[PDB]
């Protein structure tokens, strides 16, 4: 039928209560939004005075002052900005979803460098979260002084000049609620503004009753506090990186976080793409005691919008393994929601993260040139590197180049795997390494004896994260990594010596068979290996399962008792050193009498000591020591 | 439009209000104690104010009775006047105790919300699922109904499992479709393989046969463990994914035999 | 394989720290940090009105990272298991005069307690050591000075005025490596009159720390 | 005069764009909001029919029909509610922050069992987050059928509809944006349905063009029904089981279930469930903590178990359905998170009660404990306020037990009249600790120890300082106290003198290997043994802590407990050594033996061996000597 046309309506009486009551959960945004508005007015002046200096004839100084009045339970915000006209108080201030910042967005075609903060035309009314009533006394240069007045009760009023000199900007009177007196406290005020007005271009001061000595001068101290200090920390990333030096940049770091020492490593990140933003990355000289305390919320990389603290979700801004880099991300192109407490379209941060990580890797690469400070960096955050390698498979291409180890040839000097590789022999087609509990353990292990005899370099690994990294890093610079702890350690060697080993296998064939029977259900396979030199034998890990170190780590560290995995992972073999005097003797003893229990017991003893030398825990160490005590008694004639 | 009623909630174990130099393991308990002592002090105050009010109330009530008596008394009106003034004072005292009680009411209005003031135990009912009575059903009878309808009901889901190859996909799949972890499923997969042979779909047949033995494997050691296959099927994936190659091959031969 | 973490609780009691600490002259800079760690903790506790005049050396945790953590906030929530039979009778060289005067808990009370503890840290040895509460004051007074019954608080159970007046003994020279600035902070904390003492905040924000 | 009065204004042109851009973050919620409104209207009918059943003449069925239309790229939602009059369309529907739900609720003030939501009066406009244009066609029982058309462009139009009749209620036509066609996907729709509408009281159906490709009425779309809304006394185990199995999707039913409701400022109903088996990803650090979900009026709000429950209770499944919470304008977020903490506390109390009653059921408790004792022990470690309660649930194997675990209180009931402490021993295995020299004398003295074989027991026992007034003591540490007969005490002092110089010699030999050398009657069958000082890590703790990938090794300067060599003066070896000291304290062979014995003891006592190669090399040397090799 006849189509009737209607305009959309709005129940302002309900809407206003929704604005105040349902739009925000954190009442700290009270001061944030009030300050933001003041800074917008100051931006309005900057522009007008920029193009026309006479705009400052009624005041040049641009700042935001806050004066609490506990005797009234009120707060005063002094906005020295351009202010509002009577019409603006009625039209802009008194209208929901109405903002004069939009007028400047459109008007400022020349003012491309004038960036207003926010644009909803609603945030003003969040003042009533804690205030019972708000009065806005203002005098824009194009009008007289008026006093806007409302308690957010469905209406507002505007009064004529009352004689209290406001020739510029506005005086905002914040009548606080009976239960909001905490905002009259110096501490509380500071807590809020430090988290929200941290990088306001214009200085914010507080006028506080100064704690002082009784005015009996005999002694007396100053009556009031001028807290300009709130904005002592300025934006750094906003300046040209080439013109930013450490004399100020290092000061920023020490101000960024309470650390009275210059940073270790840093990286400016300037993005001119769709997601325009700049960011400063900071690496501490020392890792924090809470570095791995994942129970605590992250806050190293913070997200600012138009130099206003918005988010600090490092969970999205960075990857877990980079949770040591502290910094500031500042964008003016982000789609924050109506509360401004959360960024809409998190896919934005996904892109931002990726881009930041790229620069993190570039920083690490830059650091690698500075061997001295790199070593310091590496040592401070080597676990994070190794965690990154373990987790972030995509960037192992770069993270694995940052690895540094002590080897059998570098010894006490920690060297790069790329240096290892560049110094490999023409037969050394794989990276030889050994993991364990400590350096002197693996450096004196039977596993690396022949390896050294073959002139091969062994990478010494001792951390559990090293044990984890070798489960992820398989090849480096095109060459595979080979643990000397596993069966099948194919060292490059003379074929004729291999023939000698085969003849030795025949020689000790029956010995191996006997030992296998002796160690039935103790070892999966008894065999011969020339990886051994000084030892008569050695328990080795298989090509599958957990290593002795890995078992140690997993079985003790894991909170989950995965006996199924442990069962499948618990694999090991026994290697024999055919050149060892004992082994030689054992063969002779087997030939003399394979049923000689004393020999069999000796084999068991050697097995248990082989387990010990290879890091395998004994199933009953007490009985091992008992044998020792028995042997001792025999030696003592007991 | 007004949630201000919950703007004053006190939580003695609020882990979001801590400090680096403070051990909250004891602080939270301090908060508890303080909260309790406060309430005790509050209650004592209120009771004493109520007591005082009632005492003055009774005193003035009795004085008022006496005022009536003094009025009646032949010349007791001299004493009446005196007592009236005293009764007024007693009323004023009563009043002030009530005013103090009004202040207590104001204090109650200002009182922080907590587990003792926000709510009461409206309903509580426990139950431990012990039983469902040591019993047993004839699985052949069950299959007579189940194999015929279950298999058809989830035929596509059985086939979906049969079309998997990645161990992660198979495990996750059965996690989502755990009802398929049974003999009826495996039986279909065997039959399906036979049908695939007939249809010349040997590539699929082999993959289905692979997944057949996976389900049979689940059944194999579920029976060995004397447990419901659906309660332990993830352990088979745990075993397969962690088993040494040589042992895995041995298990596969045992498995093929089990099928 | 899934990943999960578990963390160890720090049992490094201040007393243990002191037992591990070196001879009189404990690095003032280390103490300065521990002092401001303690006082920062107090500001929080004062902000939360935490009452704990019973806080003693052993209720102070010094972690492996040099962090002071405070625990055991008053008898009301402590010693729920086997405790001392002389938790009070024991020499209360670490309890404020206000404790010894049988008054109450306050910012100055708390700081008086730890003030002596800080001196203990410097000395690796209790600052004072008396018998009764009056005798404990008789040792306290030797360092901070003593006046007659004209600088005593109202809440006094001890025979005020029966404490023969005496001078102070420059805390700077008495306590090992006590830099004058800290000597003044300590003397302020040790001062008999709780209202002549310095608050946790004021001391915390002092350039000494 | 000197003041002018103005009403507050609202720039709808801006406001509207804020509503459909900044007020919301997620956009799939448009289904929730429209469905919620539909169910409100269905409740409106119900209520009205309670007073006049003939109001059901224009259709006697209450449901929500979802009919996607890919050919147009639109979505038709049929709400079989009362409907809206033209006046309501132009007054309520086309008005910001306004809803007749409130007015209906005002009518409900006369007494009703009706429960609706819609205090904001804006949810309709969330449709424009996804749809380019929305058309609402309706037929109120008291008015004609009208078509309400708008693209949220500051205006809307209304005309009487023609063609297909609506008995009652309203239809919403979502002219979906070109990049919003993913909402035409079955899966995507069902995703959102399962996300927020899984407990809608009214039937919601999904029509899909399937076999013959015709709209198939998926009636089971939201067949899941609320259980906590029902009277728990009238709910059977089979019903609780089926709910659990539906809740968790676990073919196996729950171990235990408990209904819990509170009344007052905080008001809710809830079901808590204990699973029979633990999940394979129970400990996964990145696992979403959503075991128990939070609803308001059966509307899914959030599932943040990170704050709802303790981490050590992060296995209990359930639903908490509140009656009135302070939700933000964005319902997805709840204001005043302290409320959740209050809820938590109350839940914990009830979980503990359920656990206690579960403990009464010994057989099922054992099953529970076996699966979740790690969480129990975690609670001992993490929770300083409920530790005592949690400690009542602890069960261990002990010397007088078999493979049956026993409570700490049961241990206490078997303590001797002179026993002031609970003896225990930690380790890797029960057999290991059962064969320890440290529990031999303890057994000889008639005492029972508690066997602790998990690595987490080092964290648990750290908190278990005293239980039922009884102290606890490790047999592996120095200062192990066992009954000392004065006669024996004298004999031990004589023995101390007897082996005094021997111990001194041993210390000289192993000055930097052992902190103190002394005899002790804690040993029975062993010549010697290494103990841990009461300060620092135990052999077990040390080993375990040194297996941690992310540990800080510099902290070990505060944790490296002293090692002491206990000597058992009753052995021939020890006696021989004494005699050998008398013969020649400088005898190298004897000194070598002392070193051997120490490493032997150190190793067998569970302490790290400094050099297994050298240790075994000594052994190889001794073997060669036995073999006559060299
Ligand atoms: N202190 C102030 N000085 C000048 N104008 C102000 C002040 N406070 C509010 N206003 C008026 O309010 C308008 C917008 O403020 P409001 O904060 O409500 O919206 P916004 O700041 O643009 O974005 P948001 O609504 O998110 O804060 C400004 O354009 C200005 O007209
Ligand atoms: N199925 C329906 N039948 C009848 N009226 C309806 C139906 N769905 C919506 N309405 C009308 O739509 C109007 C707009 O309300 P809307 O749903 O946007 O607010 P609300 O959703 O109730 O509040 P909230 O934003 O909190 O959900 C209501 O006045 C209601 O009468
Ligand atoms: Mg603003
Ligand atoms: Mg609605």
- Secondary structure (DSSP) of D48-104: HHHH-GGGGSS-----EEEEEETTTTEEEEEE-S----HHHIIIIITEET--HHHHH
C-alpha distance from residue A21 to each of A127, B7, D98, D328, D503 (Å): 11, 11, 16, 8, 78
- Residue A424's CB is within 10 A of a number of other CB atoms, namely 17
**D71, exposed or middle or buried, with CB in 10 Å at 0-12, 13-18, 19+?**
exposed
Spell out the alpha helix ranges (H) of C85-161.
Answer: 97-100, 107-123, 133-144
Structure tokens of B86?
Answer: 């005293």
Q: Which of D38, D63, D118 to mutate to test the pocket of ligand 2 (most atoms within 8 A of CB)?
A: D118
Q: Please tell me whether residue D516 adopts helix, strand or coil conformation.
A: strand
Adjacent-strand bridge partners of D317: D273
Residues D404 and D374 in one domain: no
Q: Do D298 and D286 share a structural domain? A: yes
- The Cα D340–Cα A622 span in angstroms is 53
- Provide the H-helix boundaries in A269-393: 314-317, 347-369, 371-391
Evaluate whether A314 touches A299 at the Cβ level (below 8 Å). Answer: yes
- Four-residue CA torsion sign, A179, A184, A186, A190: positive
Residue A145 three-state SS:
coil
- Residue D176 pairs with which residues in a beta bridge? D131
- The dihedral over CA atoms of B99, B104, B108, B112, expressed in degrees to the nearest 10, equals 130
Output the CA D118–ligand 2 centroid distance in Å. Answer: 7
The rounded distance, in Å, linking the Cα atoms of A521 and A527 is 15
Specify the 3-state DSSP secondary structure of A21: helix
Residue-range definition of the domain harbouring residue A423 = 395-638
| Boundary of a domain, candidates D352, D368, D385 | D385
Using CB atoms, which residue from B23, B31, B37 is nearest to C61? B23
Count CB neighbours of C178 within 10 A.
Answer: 24
- Residue A616, CA distances (Å) to A522, A607, D269 in order: 12, 11, 54
Do A177 and A109 share a domain, yes or no? yes
CB A330 within 8 A of CB A235: yes
DSSP at A521:
T
User: Alpha-carbon distance A173 to A133, whole Å?
Assistant: 8
Q: What angle do CA D507, D510, D516 make, to 5 degrees?
A: 45
The alpha-carbon gap from A289 to the nearest alpha carbon of chain D, in Å, equals: 8
- Tokens 């029979």 found at: D276
Determine the atom of ligand 1 nearest the C-alpha atom of A44. 4
Comparing CA positions, the residue from C107, C36, C38 lying closest to residue C71 is C38
Helix/strand/coil for D4? strand
CB contact under 8 A, D25 and A468: no
Residue A296 sits at the chain C interface (C-beta within 8 Å): no
User: Which residues of D sit in the known binding site?
Assistant: 37, 79, 98, 124, 331
Query: Which technique?
Result: cryo-EM
Which residue's CA is the closest to the ligand 2 atom numbered 21? D123
Residue ranges and CATH numbers for the domains of chain C are 1-209 (1.10.510.10)
Which residue from D122, D92, D157 is spatially nearest to A97, judged by alpha carbons? D122
Distance CA D168, CA D81 (A): 6
Both tokens of A405, joined, read 């180890």
| Residue D123 Cβ contacting ligand 2 at under 6 Å | yes
CA-nearest residue to C6 within chain A is A559
Residue nearest to atom 17 of ligand 1 (CA): A123
Q: Are residues D438 and D484 in the same domain?
A: yes
Which 8-state DSSP code applies to residue A221?
-
Residue of C nearest to D282 (CA): C2
- What CATH number is attached to the domain comprising A1? 3.30.565.10
Q: Which residues, including other chains, have CB under 8 Å from residue D268's CB and lie 6 or more apart?
A: D261, D262, D320, D321, D322, D323, D343
Provide CB contacts within 8 A for A570, sequence distance 6+: A545, A546, A551
What is the rounded CA–CA span in Å between residue D359 and residue B2?
45
CB distance D231 to B123 below 8 Å? no
Of B117, B123, B120, nearest in space to B6 by CA: B117
Chains in contact with B, counting 3 or more C-beta pairs less than 8 Å apart as contact: A, C, D
Alpha-carbon distances of C33 from A463, C30, C67, D1, D36, rounded to whole Å: 32, 5, 9, 64, 58
Contacts of A568 in chain B (CB under 8 A): 239, 242-244, 247
Q: In the structure encoding, which two tokens stand for residue A626, read together?
A: 């008992």
CATH number of A290's domain: 3.30.230.80
Which of D189, D223, D257 finishes a domain? D223
D219 with D229, same domain?
Answer: no
Rounded Cα distance between D477 and D492, Å, is 19
Based on the domain organization, do D364 and D472 belong to the same domain? no
Name the residue facing D350 among B5, B124, B178 (closest C-beta). B124
- Do you know the residue count of chain B? 259
- Please list every residue in chain A whose beta carbon sits closer than 8 Å to the beta carbon of residue B222: none
Residues A380 and A441 in one domain: no
Question: Which of A1, A3, A5, A10 would best serve as a mutation to test chain D binding (most D beta carbons within 10 A)?
Answer: A10
Question: Which candidate, B189, B183, B162, places its Cα nearest to that of B228?
Answer: B183
Question: CA–CA separation, A604 vs A599, rounded Å?
Answer: 9
Chain C nearest C-alpha distance from A543 (Å): 18
Task: For residue D9, report the distance from its CA to the centre of ligand 1, in Å.
Answer: 15
Helices (H), D269-322: 305-308
Q: Which domain holds residue B43?
A: 1-132
Go through chain A and tell me how many residues it has.
638
**C-alpha angle B107-B28-C199 in degrees, rounded to nearest 5:** 80
Chains B and C form CB pairs within 8 A to the count of 52
Place of tokens 């539906």: D246
What is residue A267's three-state secondary structure?
Answer: strand
Question: Considering CB atoms only, which of B4, B8, B238 is closest to A564?
Answer: B238
Chain D residue whose CA is closest to A621 = D604
Q: Is the CB of A487 under 6 A from ligand 1?
A: no
Q: Are strands D470-474 and A308-311 parallel, antiparallel or unpaired?
A: unpaired
A36 CA: nearest ligand 1 atom: 21
Structural contact between residues C106 and C86, judged by C-beta atoms closer than 8 angstroms: no
Report CB contact under 8 Å: A4, D615: no
- The DSSP line for D190-218 is HHHHHHH-TT-SS-EEEEEEE---EEEEE
> Are A154 and A208 found together in one domain?
yes
Is the C-beta atom of D39 inside 6 A of ligand 2?
A: no
CA nearest to B232 within chain A: A564
C82 contact residues in D (CB cutoff 8 A): 466, 471
* φ and ψ at residue B87, rounded to 5 degrees: -65, -40
Domain final residue pick, A345, A375, A394: A394
Q: Which residues of C touch B (CB under 8 A)?
A: 37-38, 40-41, 44-45, 48-52, 61, 67-74, 76-78
Query: Is the separation of the CB atoms in D7 and D167 below 8 Å?
Result: no
Structure tokens at A34: 């009030």
- Same domain flag for D239 and D360: yes
Numbers of helices and strands, H then E, in chain D: 20, 25
Using CB atoms and an 8 Å cut-off, which of residues 62-81 of chain C contact chain A? Answer: 63-65, 67
Q: Which residues of A touch C4 (CB under 8 A)?
A: 558-560
Intra-chain end-to-end CA distance of chain B, in Å: 66
Q: Is the CB of A94 under 6 A from ligand 1?
A: no
Helix axes A621-636, D612-627, angle to 10 degrees: 40
Distance between terminal CA atoms of chain A? 118
- Cis? peptide before B132, omega within 30° of 0: yes
The separation between CA A218 and the C-alpha centre of its own chain, rounded to angstroms, equals: 54
Q: Residue A611 corresponds to which tokens in the numbers above? A: 């387990």
Q: Which of D384, D461, D373 is nearest to D424 (CA)?
A: D461
Q: How far lies A563's CA from each of A400, B116, D427, in Å?
A: 32, 45, 17
| D162: Cβ contacts below 8 Å, ≥ 6 apart | A1
* Residue A545 in contact with partner chain B when CB distance is under 8 A: yes
Residue A160, beta-bridge partner list: A146
D524 to chain C, any CB pair closer than 8 A? The answer is no
d(CA A559, CA D56): 60
Nearest Cα to Cα of residue D393 among D467, D306, D471, D311: D467
β partners of residue A208: A225
The two structure tokens encoding residue A252? 């920023």
Are D546 and A337 inside 8 Å of each other by CB?
Answer: no
Q: Which of D306, D384, D388, D459 to mutate to test the interface with B (most CBs of B within 10 A)?
A: D384
Neighbours of D299 (CB within 10 A): 21
E strands of A364-456, at which residues?
Answer: 404-407, 414-416, 431-435
- Residues of chain B found within 8 Å of residue C71, distances taken between Cβ atoms: 22-23, 25-27
Looking at the structure, do residues D183 and D118 belong to the same domain, yes or no?
Answer: yes
Residues A149 and A239 in one domain: no
> Which residues on A lie below 8 Å from C32 (Cβ)?
none
C207 neighbors C36 (Cβ within 8 angstroms)? no
**What's the first-to-final CA gap in chain D, in angstroms?**
120
Q: Is the dihedral of CA B134, B137, B139, B145 positive or negative?
A: negative
* Alpha carbons A597 and A517: distance in angstroms, whole number: 12
Between the two ends of chain C, the Cα-to-Cα distance in Å is: 48
Longest CA pairwise span in chain A (Å): 121
Element (H, E) at D114: none
Q: Which of residues 40-99 of B touch D (CB under 8 A)?
A: none
H-helix or E-strand containing C17? helix C14-20
- Residue pair B229/B182 in contact by the 8 Å Cβ criterion: yes
Would the CB atoms of B30 and C76 count as touching at under 8 Å? yes
Q: Cα–Cα distance between A154 and A20 in angstroms, integer? A: 12
Nearest C-alpha to atom 23 of ligand 1 is from which residue? A119
Which residues of C are identified as catalytic?
54
Residues D125 and D140 in one domain: yes
Cβ atoms < 10 Å from Cβ of B79: 15
Contact criterion met (CB below 8 Å) for D319 and D285: no
Asked whether B1 and A18 are in contact (CB, 8 A), the reply is: yes
Q: Residue C177 region, left (φ>0) first, then alpha (ψ -120 to 50), else beta? A: left
CB D84 within 8 A of CB D144: no
A252 CA to centre of own chain? 19
Say if CB D540 and CB D522 are below 8 A apart. Answer: no
Distances in Å between the alpha carbon of D30 and those of A12, D14, D95, D186, D193?
Answer: 23, 21, 18, 16, 11
Cβ(A312)–Cβ(A298) under 8 Å? yes
The residues that bridge with D412 in the sheet, in sequence order, are: none
- Residue B4 at interface with chain D, using a CB cutoff of 8 Å: no
Q: Do B119 and D262 touch (CB under 8 A)?
A: yes
The radius of gyration of chain C's CA atoms, rounded to the nearest angstrom, is 17
Q: Which two tokens stand for residue A633?
A: 């008694």
| CB neighbour class for A112 (10 Å; exposed up to 12, middle 13-18, buried from 19) | exposed
- D37 Cα: distance to centroid of ligand 2 (angstroms): 5
List the binding residues of A: 37, 79, 98, 124, 340
Question: What total number of domains does chain A contain?
Answer: 3
DSSP 8-state code for residue D482:
-
C-alpha C198/C-alpha C202 separation (Å) is 6
The CA-based diameter of chain C, rounded to the nearest angstrom, is 74
């Amino acid at each position: 039928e006849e189509v009737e046309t209607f305009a959309f309506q709005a129940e302002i009486a309900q809407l206003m209560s929704l604005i105040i009551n349902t739009f925000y959960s954190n009442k700290e945004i009270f001061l944030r939004e009030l300050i933001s508005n003041a800074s917008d007015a100051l931006d309005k002046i900057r522009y007008e005075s920029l193009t026309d200096p006479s705009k400052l004839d009624s005041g040049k100084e641009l700042k935001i002052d806050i004066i609490p009045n506990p005797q009234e339970r009120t707060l005063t915000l002094v906005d020295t900005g351009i202010g509002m006209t009577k019409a603006d108080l009625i039209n802009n201030l008194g209208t929901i979803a109405k903002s004069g910042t939009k007028a400047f967005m459109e008007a400022l075609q020349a003012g491309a460098d004038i960036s207003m903060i926010g644009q909803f035309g609603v945030g003003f009314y969040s003042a009533y979260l804690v205030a019972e009533k708000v009065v806005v006394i203002t005098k824009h240069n194009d009008d007289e002084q008026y006093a806007w007045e409302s308690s957010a009760g469905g209406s507002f009023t505007v009064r004529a000049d009352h004689g209290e000199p406001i020739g510029r900007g506005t005086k905002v009177i914040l009548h606080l609620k009976e239960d909001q007196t905490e905002y009259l406290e110096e501490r509380r005020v500071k807590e809020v503004v430090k988290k929200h007005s941290q990088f306001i271009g214009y200085p914010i001061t507080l006028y506080l009753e100064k704690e002082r000595e009784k005015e009996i001068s005999k002694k007396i101290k100053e009556k009031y506090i001028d807290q300009e200090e709130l904005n002592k920390t300025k934006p750094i990333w906003t300046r040209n990186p080439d013109d930013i030096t450490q004399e100020e940049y290092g000061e920023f770091y020490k101000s960024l976080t309470n650390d009275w020492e210059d940073h270790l490593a840093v990286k400016h990140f300037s993005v001119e793409g769709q997601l325009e933003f700049r960011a400063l990355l900071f690496i501490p000289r020392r890792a924090p005691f809470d570095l791995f305390e994942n129970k605590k919320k992250k806050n190293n990389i913070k997200l600012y919008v138009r130099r206003v603290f918005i988010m600090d979700s490092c969970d999205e801004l960075i990857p877990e393994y980079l949770n040591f880099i502290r910094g500031v991300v500042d964008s003016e192109d982000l789609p924050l929601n109506i509360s401004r407490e959360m960024l809409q379209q998190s896919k934005i941060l996904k892109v931002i993260r990726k881009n930041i990580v790229k620069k993190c890797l570039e920083l690490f690469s830059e650091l690698a040139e500075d061997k001295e400070n790199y070593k310091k960096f590496y040592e401070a955050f080597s676990k994070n590197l190794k965690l990154g390698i373990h987790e972030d498979s995509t960037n192992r291409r770069r993270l694995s180049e940052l690895l540094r180890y002590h080897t059998s040839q570098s010894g006490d000097e920690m060297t790069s795997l790329s240096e290892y590789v560049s110094r490999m022999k023409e037969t050394q087609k794989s990276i030889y390494y050994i993991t364990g509990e400590s350096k002197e353990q693996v450096a004196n292990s039977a596993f690396v004896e022949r390896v050294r005899k073959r002139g091969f370099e062994v990478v010494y690994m001792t951390e559990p994260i090293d044990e984890y990294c070798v489960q992820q890093l398989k090849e480096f610079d095109g060459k595979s990594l080979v643990s000397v702890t596993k069966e099948g350690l194919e060292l490059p060697e003379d074929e004729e010596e291999k023939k000698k080993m085969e003849e030795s296998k025949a020689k000790f064939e029956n010995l191996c068979k006997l030992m296998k029977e002796i160690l039935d259900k103790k070892v999966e396979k008894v065999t011969i290996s020339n990886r051994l030199v000084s030892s008569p034998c050695c328990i080795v890990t298989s090509t599958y399962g957990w290593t002795a170190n890995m078992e140690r780590i997993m079985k003790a560290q894991a909170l989950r008792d995965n006996s199924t995995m442990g069962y499948m992972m618990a694999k090991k073999h026994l290697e024999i050193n055919p050149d060892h005097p004992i082994v030689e003797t054992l063969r002779q003893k087997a030939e003399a009498d394979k049923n000689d229990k004393a020999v069999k017991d000796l084999v068991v003893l050697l097995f248990e000591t082989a387990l010990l030398s290879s890091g395998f825990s004994l199933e009953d160490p007490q009985t091992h020591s008992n044998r020792i005590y028995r042997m001792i008694k025999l030696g003592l004639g007991i | 439009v007004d949630y201000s009623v919950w703007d004053h909630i006190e939580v003695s174990d609020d882990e979001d209000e801590t400090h680096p130099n403070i051990d909250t393991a004891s602080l939270f308990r301090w908060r508890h104690q303080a909260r309790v002592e406060r309430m005790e002090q509050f209650q004592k105050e209120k009771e004493e104010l109520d007591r005082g009010c009632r005492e003055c109330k009774r005193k003035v009530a009795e004085c008022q009775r006496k005022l009536k008596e003094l009025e009646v008394a032949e010349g007791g009106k001299a004493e009446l006047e005196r007592l009236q003034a005293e009764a007024q004072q007693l009323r004023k005292e009563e009043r002030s105790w009530e005013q103090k009680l009004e202040e207590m009411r104001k204090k109650e209005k200002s009182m922080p919300w907590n587990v003792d003031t926000l709510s009461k135990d409206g309903f509580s009912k426990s139950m431990v699922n012990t039983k469902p009575e040591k019993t047993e059903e004839d699985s052949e009878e069950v299959r007579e109904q189940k194999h015929k309808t279950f298999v058809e009901k989830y035929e596509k889901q059985i086939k979906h499992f049969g079309m998997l190859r990645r161990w992660d996909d198979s495990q996750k799949y059965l996690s989502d479709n755990v009802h398929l972890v049974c003999e009826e499923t495996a039986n279909y997969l065997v039959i399906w393989c036979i049908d695939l042979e007939v249809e010349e779909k040997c590539a699929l047949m082999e993959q289905v046969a692979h997944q057949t033995i996976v389900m049979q494997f689940i059944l194999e050691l579920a029976k060995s463990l004397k447990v419901d296959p659906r309660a332990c099927f993830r352990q088979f994936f745990t075993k397969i994914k962690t088993a040494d190659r040589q042992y895995m091959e041995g298990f596969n031969d045992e498995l093929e035999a089990f099928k | 394989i899934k990943v999960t973490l578990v963390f160890e609780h720090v049992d490094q009691d201040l007393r243990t720290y002191l037992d591990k600490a070196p001879p009189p002259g404990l690095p003032a800079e280390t103490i300065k940090d521990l002092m401001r760690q303690f006082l920062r903790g107090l500001d929080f506790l004062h902000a939360n009105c935490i009452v704990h005049r019973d806080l003693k050396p052993e209720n102070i945790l010094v972690t492996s990272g040099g962090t002071v953590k405070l625990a055991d906030f008053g008898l009301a929530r402590i010693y729920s298991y086997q405790m001392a039979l002389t938790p009070v009778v024991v020499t209360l060289w670490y309890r404020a005069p206000e404790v010894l005067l049988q008054s109450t808990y306050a910012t100055p009370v708390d700081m008086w307690s730890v003030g002596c503890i800080f001196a203990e840290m410097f000395r690796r040895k209790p600052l004072f050591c008396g018998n009764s509460e009056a005798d404990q004051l008789g040792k306290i007074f030797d360092l901070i000075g003593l006046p007659p019954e004209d600088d005593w608080p109202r809440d006094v159970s001890l025979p005020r005025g029966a404490f023969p007046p005496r001078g102070p003994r420059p805390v700077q020279s008495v306590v090992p490596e006590m830099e004058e600035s800290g000597a003044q902070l300590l003397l302020e904390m040790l001062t008999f009159n709780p209202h002549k003492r310095i608050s946790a905040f004021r001391a915390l924000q002092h350039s000494y720390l």
